[PDB]
Amino acid sequence: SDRVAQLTIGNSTITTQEAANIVIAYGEWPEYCPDTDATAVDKPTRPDVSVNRFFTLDTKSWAKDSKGWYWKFPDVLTEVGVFGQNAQFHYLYRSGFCVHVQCNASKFHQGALLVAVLPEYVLGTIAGGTGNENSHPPYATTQPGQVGAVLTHPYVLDAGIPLSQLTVCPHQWINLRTNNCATIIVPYMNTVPFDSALNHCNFGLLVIPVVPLDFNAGATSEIPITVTIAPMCAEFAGLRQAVKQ
Amino acid sequence: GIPTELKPGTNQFLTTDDGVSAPILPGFHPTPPIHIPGEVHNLLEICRVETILEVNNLKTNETTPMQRLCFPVSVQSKTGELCAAFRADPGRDGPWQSTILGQLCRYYTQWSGSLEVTFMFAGSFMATGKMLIAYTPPGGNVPADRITAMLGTHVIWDFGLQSSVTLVVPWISNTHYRAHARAGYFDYYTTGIITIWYQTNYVVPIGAPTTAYIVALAAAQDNFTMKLCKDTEDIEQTANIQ
Amino acid sequence: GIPTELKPGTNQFLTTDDGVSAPILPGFHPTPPIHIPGEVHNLLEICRVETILEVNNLKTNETTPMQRLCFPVSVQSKTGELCAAFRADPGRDGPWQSTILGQLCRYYTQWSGSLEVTFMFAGSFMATGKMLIAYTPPGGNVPADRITAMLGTHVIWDFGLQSSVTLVVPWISNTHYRAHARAGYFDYYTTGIITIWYQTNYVVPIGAPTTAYIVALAAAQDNFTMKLCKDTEDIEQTANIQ
Amino acid sequence: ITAMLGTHVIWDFGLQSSVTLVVPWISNTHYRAHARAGYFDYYTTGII
Amino acid sequence: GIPTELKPGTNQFLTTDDGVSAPILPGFHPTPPIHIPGEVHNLLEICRV
Amino acid sequence: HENSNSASEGSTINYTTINYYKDAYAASAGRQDMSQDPKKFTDPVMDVIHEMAPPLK
Amino acid sequence: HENSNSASEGSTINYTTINYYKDAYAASAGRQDMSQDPKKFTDPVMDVIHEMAPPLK
Amino acid sequence: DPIADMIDSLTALQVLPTAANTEASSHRLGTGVVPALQAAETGASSNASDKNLIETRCVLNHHSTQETAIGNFFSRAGLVSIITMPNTDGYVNWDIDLMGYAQLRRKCELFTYMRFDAEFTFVVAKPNGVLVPQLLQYMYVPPGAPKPTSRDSFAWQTATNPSVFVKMTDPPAQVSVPFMSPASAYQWFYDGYPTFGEHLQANDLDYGQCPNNMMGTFSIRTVGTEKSPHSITLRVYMRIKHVRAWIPRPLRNQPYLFKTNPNYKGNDIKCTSTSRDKITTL
Amino acid sequence: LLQYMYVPPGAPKPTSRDSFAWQTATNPSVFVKMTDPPAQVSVPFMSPA
Amino acid sequence: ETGASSNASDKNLIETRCVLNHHSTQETAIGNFFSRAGLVSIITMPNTDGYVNWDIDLMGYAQLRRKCELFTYMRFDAEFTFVVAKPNGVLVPQ
Numbered sequence A: 001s002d003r004v005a006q007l008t009i010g011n012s013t014i015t016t017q018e019a020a021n022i023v024i025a026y027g028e029w030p031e032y033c034p035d036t037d038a039t040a041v042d043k044p045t046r047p048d049v050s051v052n053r054f055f056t057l058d059t060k061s062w063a064k065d066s067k068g069w070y071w072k073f074p075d076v077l078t079e080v081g082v083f084g085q086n087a088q089f090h091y092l093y094r095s096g097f098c099v100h101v102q103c104n105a106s107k108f109h110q111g112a113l114l115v116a117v118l119p120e121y122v123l124g125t126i127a128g129g130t131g132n133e134n135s136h137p138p139y140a141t142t143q144p145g146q147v148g149a150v151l152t153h154p155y156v157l158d159a160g161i162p163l164s165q166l167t168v169c170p171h172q173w174i175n176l177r178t179n180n181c182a183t184i185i186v187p188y189m190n191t192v193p194f195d196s197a198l199n200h201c202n203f204g205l206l207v208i209p210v211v212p213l214d215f216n217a218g219a220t221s222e223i224p225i226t227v228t229i230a231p232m233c234a235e236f237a238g239l240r241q242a243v244k245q
Numbered sequence B, C: 001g002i003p004t005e006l007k008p009g010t011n012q013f014l015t016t017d018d019g020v021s022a023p024i025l026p027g028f029h030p031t032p033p034i035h036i037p038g039e040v041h042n043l044l045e046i047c048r049v050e051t052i053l054e055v056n057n058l059k060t061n062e063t064t065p066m067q068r069l070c071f072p073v074s075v076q077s078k079t080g081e082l083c084a085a086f087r088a089d090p091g092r093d094g095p096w097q098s099t100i101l102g103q104l105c106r107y108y109t110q111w112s113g114s115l116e117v118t119f120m121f122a123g124s125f126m127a128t129g130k131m132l133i134a135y136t137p138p139g140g141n142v143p144a145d146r147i148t149a150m151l152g153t154h155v156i157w158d159f160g161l162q163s164s165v166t167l168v169v170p171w172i173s174n175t176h177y178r179a180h181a182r183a184g185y186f187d188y189y190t191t192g193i194i195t196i197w198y199q200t201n202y203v204v205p206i207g208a209p210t211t212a213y214i215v216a217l218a219a220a221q222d223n224f225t226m227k228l229c230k231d232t233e234d235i236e237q238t239a240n241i242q
Numbered sequence D: 001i002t003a004m005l006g007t008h009v010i011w012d013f014g015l016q017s018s019v020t021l022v023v024p025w026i027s028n029t030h031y032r033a034h035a036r037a038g039y040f041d042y043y044t045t046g047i048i
Numbered sequence E: 001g002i003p004t005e006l007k008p009g010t011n012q013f014l015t016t017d018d019g020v021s022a023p024i025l026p027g028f029h030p031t032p033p034i035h036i037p038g039e040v041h042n043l044l045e046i047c048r049v
Numbered sequence F, G: 001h002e003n004s005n006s007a008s009e010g011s012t013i014n015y016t017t018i019n020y021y022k023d024a025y026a027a028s029a030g031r032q033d034m035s036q037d038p039k040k041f042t043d044p045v046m047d048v049i050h051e052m053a054p055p056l057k
Numbered sequence H: 001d002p003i004a005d006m007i008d009s010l011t012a013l014q015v016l017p018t019a020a021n022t023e024a025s026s027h028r029l030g031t032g033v034v035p036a037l038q039a040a041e042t043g044a045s046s047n048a049s050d051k052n053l054i055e056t057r058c059v060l061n062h063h064s065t066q067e068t069a070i071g072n073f074f075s076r077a078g079l080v081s082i083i084t085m086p087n088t089d090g091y092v093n094w095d096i097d098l099m100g101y102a103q104l105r106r107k108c109e110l111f112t113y114m115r116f117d118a119e120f121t122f123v124v125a126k127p128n129g130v131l132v133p134q135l136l137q138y139m140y141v142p143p144g145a146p147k148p149t150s151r152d153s154f155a156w157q158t159a160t161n162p163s164v165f166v167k168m169t170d171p172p173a174q175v176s177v178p179f180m181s182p183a184s185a186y187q188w189f190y191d192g193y194p195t196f197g198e199h200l201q202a203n204d205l206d207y208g209q210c211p212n213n214m215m216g217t218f219s220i221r222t223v224g225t226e227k228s229p230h231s232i233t234l235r236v237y238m239r240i241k242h243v244r245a246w247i248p249r250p251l252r253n254q255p256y257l258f259k260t261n262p263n264y265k266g267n268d269i270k271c272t273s274t275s276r277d278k279i280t281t282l
Numbered sequence I: 001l002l003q004y005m006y007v008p009p010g011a012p013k014p015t016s017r018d019s020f021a022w023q024t025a026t027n028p029s030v031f032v033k034m035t036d037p038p039a040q041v042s043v044p045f046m047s048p049a
Numbered sequence J: 001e002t003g004a005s006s007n008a009s010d011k012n013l014i015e016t017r018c019v020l021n022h023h024s025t026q027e028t029a030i031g032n033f034f035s036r037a038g039l040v041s042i043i044t045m046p047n048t049d050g051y052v053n054w055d056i057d058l059m060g061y062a063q064l065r066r067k068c069e070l071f072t073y074m075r076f077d078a079e080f081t082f083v084v085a086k087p088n089g090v091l092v093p094q
Ligand SMILES: CCCCCCCCCCCCC/C=C/[C@H](O)[C@H](N)CO
Pocket: B024, H096, H097, H098, H099, H118, H120, H138, H139, H140, H162, H163, H164, H175, H177, H186, H187, H188, H213, H214, H215, H218
């Protein structure tokens, strides 16, 4: 009876009846910055309900030949709600996250998704194909917003590193015969206690179908994937006029 | 001054020598460390993490390499067929190259300890079946039939609400450590062969697909160690970087 | 004698190495020290002293360089105009080069801590006025109007019997230390922009002049430190001295 | 994406066939008169 | 540094000299020894046969 | 007595270090600490999973 | 025992020095003293100025 | 107090010098207790052991775990630079970037963050390996300091910059270098842009460049005023000491192309494994 | 100037004078000159038995 | 006008948090600022009879001269290093 779960934070609640555990990334819960680690001297703001709540992004469609999707954090929320306004009016930000990915299907469907969190997900290019061009990814690719982007070569994760050892990162699976959701709680990971929300992305969320989706003709062919996220201990400092990017 | 004599080993530069060298900045103090999650102290913490085994490493899979991460299971007409077969050597070329354990083994010369392979079934809820996953100690090739393969270490896996099973590959060796197995004299250090067989059929009703897939994951146990740190053979550099 | 081995680093001359060398005069004793006022033990004692900021560093001021030490304030017709704008980077080229803090920063690579800018009004006794002095954290350019600039750290200064005010520039950074800001990748280390605006007008009666001047002074706070001592770029030597 | 900025609950179908959305008392006055078209839209509760 | 003088015998390689040389593998630990019968400690044990 | 300026103040073991200078980063590496916490990469779940119990009951 | 002939007999810290000769000026520099008196360059006035009081009342 | 709502890690370390012992076990028949059935969807690794799957004996093993500690894994000098003076006026200014040689780059990029002290060794010779009596000077130029423009520049006075004078017939020079980042660790991967502003296609080179890792310029010269007739070849080797590492990553399976980006040749994607013909025949 | 490198079994061996294997990032290596004294290293017991 | 520097702090001008910082003040001490070897002289024997008499004046090179002239008075011990070669940098037995 641990297959049922309820996540309540702010004015939002997620219920699930077909779940695995909750993964706490590297065994650490999100926290506020203590006085020994802080360096900036001004008092930070902690809104504590209007920013620490569940945010639901756009919905993907799992087809039979999907490659995979990725999102960048906290780039997905810089234009959404009161979190997106505090991130534009302040210079520094610090927070953890609770990521929840939903995908339900019937008992006659099959497939498996790998849902992983990779910190400092730096993207590469195909270098013009032949390897001679020093190409760089565009701004819509490195920071795709709340919509997200599609992976072009998911076997090398578009960065030259294999998918087969992506499970060294905090991860869960969505196996369609077993569960319909995955939940990872991520703390703040950086070399600095605060950072910019418009210039730096802490981690990337990767959702890749390792086993492809399959069903017989006559069943439902529209299988969607929804991502719902929540900041946990959001702090903001360095107040100045609003800067969008 | 004090009478001294110089010995052999004078004015040599050994790259693995640990000593005291002169500092360049007097009175310098670094930036204070903050708390970062996910600190590693030993490489054996990474070796116990399960990563995907590429059992389906076929020559026809090289242009669609996402199919190497799962191997099929289907409805059979005859009984007792084998589904897959691979060696249990983590440092040899083959399916173990795609694991983080098989990648960190390449930085060392000898290894010891027990291994584990986990198989996860990714079919429908309505699909049933039983598989026989055997581990054979060294001495022969792949067993010809199921009644030969079950004479070694094996586990019978029933599909159900728990979608995974673990085949533990126990340390059964003559030497305390094993060097990496290879064609030639170094087949003395081989571990054996892992095979998977049909115990019963893959049974399915009307309306559910007749082919499913299994993902194999591999890690190490808590008696696993490595020694004699060396250069890896996976990265190369023929052309100059940048 | 005693068996020894020579290590790498033998017969090198590192200019920052601290050791023992042979004395040239045996039995020599120096002249005894007397008490002299003004002894310095640490360079941070000099960095807390206020020196003149050259906010008026114009290209038309280069042949009359005494005008770079003060910037004017006058009677305005429109409201909310800006008087001056400059960056808060003490190690960058600009107004901070004329300070002893901005000169001693050039001998180091990284800095940390809070700063202070003091503005002293040098008009008549009969002149009144209010100014808005704002500090903006990084993210944008100079604010376009007064209602954009007051969203950051600011102070409202009223002219009176106390002729000075202090704008403290607090340490608001992501890293613990800042390298010196520069055009390129090193704009990551920028501090921000200091602007001064008219809160009300510069009001004056008959018989007193309609233009006055403000002198800006700058120093460091008691949480200020520097590190990684290096060569400065202000002095050069192309021709031989003497 | 506009509607989830308020109070919400995500409901998963399963062996428990029911869910409860609690509508909490979020008002300026201590009591509410009945809402109506006109001046009495001051007393409206909101939209589900 | 410390004043020193080099003596005769410097930079020679005597093959019967017993000293300390630099190790090539930091942190290496050997295979543990097991019990083998027939250990010899002195060559005079063989001479009495 | 030294300036306490070393990259790592931990995992170098008690003592077991050699230095001839006043700066602590000039010292040798010494023998390493054999502490390890493998369970924050292998079992990072909220409810702990016992070995013999069914892990999804 | 040494000839006590060094340029500075202060601000070199207790001990923390190395010498191999009988002359004290041949020694190494050691680690520096971290004493500082900033108030004789910043507040050198006869009547002390409190921070919150008006400084010219 | 009138307002009542304004009143308001999982694992630990242990010292394990040896590998784990094995206990003796017997057979087990029963219901309810199934240690072999797992659930890989939870994100947790398998906790099944030897004694729960087979019948085992007692093994007291003393295999040490010292060599796989990350201090022993990293304290080996590897090549980071090759600098040549054929650059025909007797000096080189080299911008410090240690990601140009694949062997040390793949070892360091196993982790995301790293904080260490270094030890640099300078092995210098002629391009064919012969040594001549020749005086050289290596100078470290921190960012912001003036870099030399010629062989007789004023910047070679090194009044505050750290400098080493060495001869080619000497042993190789060794220095200790501290941790000198403005942050708390070096990061080999920086997902973002250093500055603000618009991010157009002509400024796409800025992506991934962290100024917290840029350490300055390493300068070499022949000391005299006149031109030296000898060609120089300097090889730099780096040991990593006093190391701390965070957040392990997948190891790279593609050959490196450039020093600053993870770009890979897209026409030849290498498979991580060696292929075979059939899945049933090894 | 010469370079001696120990290549353990399984490690890549050099194919030319300018091979990538001479980067010796994990392999133990000695750099020495011919006019130097002879090099000395200590080697442990490294059998799997 | 009093000749005194400003005594206003962070906590009296803005609202601050508590910061416990451990940034050392050791490197800006004048012992660490000055204990670096800098060039003071270049002497050449092309002065064609095999000897040079050089009058000691260490104010001929601008980098160490500007560092020392930050202060009016100074009392120190020195350490002199003599790096000698040919005009092209080659060394001979001499
Ligand atoms: C005379 C002494 C000269 C030696 C000066 C060496 C100082 C440089 C030490 C830097 C330590 C590594 C810093 C980062 C290196 C990599 O290039 C960056 N991660 C680039 O990605």
